[PDB]
Amino acid sequence: MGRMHSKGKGMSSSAIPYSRNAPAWFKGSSDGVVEQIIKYARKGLTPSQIGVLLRDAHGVTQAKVITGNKILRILKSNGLAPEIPEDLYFLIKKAVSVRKHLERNRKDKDAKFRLILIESRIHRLARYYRTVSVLPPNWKYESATASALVN
């Protein structure tokens, strides 16, 4: 209901169950979960994609429930963590897409406004990550190194 950039007050989300431990009917092994997680990561799918695919295809509810640890942490321990966190990278991708659209057709002004919103969000998130020190303290997002990080 916050929705920083739009007065929308929705609460669309998920309520994960109360049982911290695994469901009683699950037959897969926590380790085998770990190896399939790592191989899908080798395929390149982001941990959100990893979670959704493991929920759709297999009895994987929450990898934290099963393996006792969370997907990004599994990747970090296994040394498959991306240099840029996925949500941030998606923000750069969206921002550069909007930038390309805007430069393509000038007069669109709501495009410019949404670009300002996206840059506000991306600066905010980068500030957070720098405080937690995931990013280098000199990591900066403006236009051109932005395009390089798009690659």
Partner 1 sequence: PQAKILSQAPTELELQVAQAFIDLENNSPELKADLRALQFKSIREIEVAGGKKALAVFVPVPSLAAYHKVQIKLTRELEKKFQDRHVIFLAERRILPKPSRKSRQTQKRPRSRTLTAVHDKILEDLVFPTEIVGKRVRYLVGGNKIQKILLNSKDVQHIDNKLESFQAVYNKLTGKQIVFEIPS
Partner 2 sequence: STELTVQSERAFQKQPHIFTNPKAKANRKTKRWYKNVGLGFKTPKTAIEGSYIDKKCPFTGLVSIRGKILTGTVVSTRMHRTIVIRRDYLHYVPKYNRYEKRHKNVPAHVSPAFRVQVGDIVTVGQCRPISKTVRFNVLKVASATGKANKQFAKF
Partner 3 sequence: VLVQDLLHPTAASEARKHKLKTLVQSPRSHFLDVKCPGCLNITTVFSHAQTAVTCESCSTVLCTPTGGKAKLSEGTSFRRK
The stretch near partner 2 (CB under 8 A) out of 11-19, 26-34, 57-65, 70-78 is 70-78
- Does the protein bind partner 2 through residue 44 (CB under 8 A)? no
Residue type, 105: N
Rounded Cα distance, 30 and 59, in Å: 11
77 binds, among partner 2, partner 3, partner 1, none (CB under 5 to 8 A by kind): partner 2
79 binds, among partner 2, partner 1, partner 3, none (CB under 5 to 8 A by kind): partner 2
DSSP 99-147: HHHHHHSTT-HHHHHHHHHHHHHHHHHHHHHHHHTSS-TT---SSHHHH
Longest dimension (CA), the chain: 59
Rounded Cα distance, 43 and 41, in Å: 5
Phi, psi at residue 127, to the nearest 5°? -60, -45
Least distance CB 11 / partner 3 (angstroms): 7
Residue type, 57: A
Least distance CB 68 / partner 1 (angstroms): 11
The pattern of x and - marking residues 14 through 53 that bind partner 1 according to CB under 8 A reads ----xx-x--x-----------------------------
- Does the protein bind partner 3 through residue 53 (CB under 8 A)? yes
- Does the protein bind partner 2 through residue 151 (CB under 8 A)? no
Judged by the rule CB under 8 A, the positions of this chain that interact with partner 1 are: 18-19, 21, 24
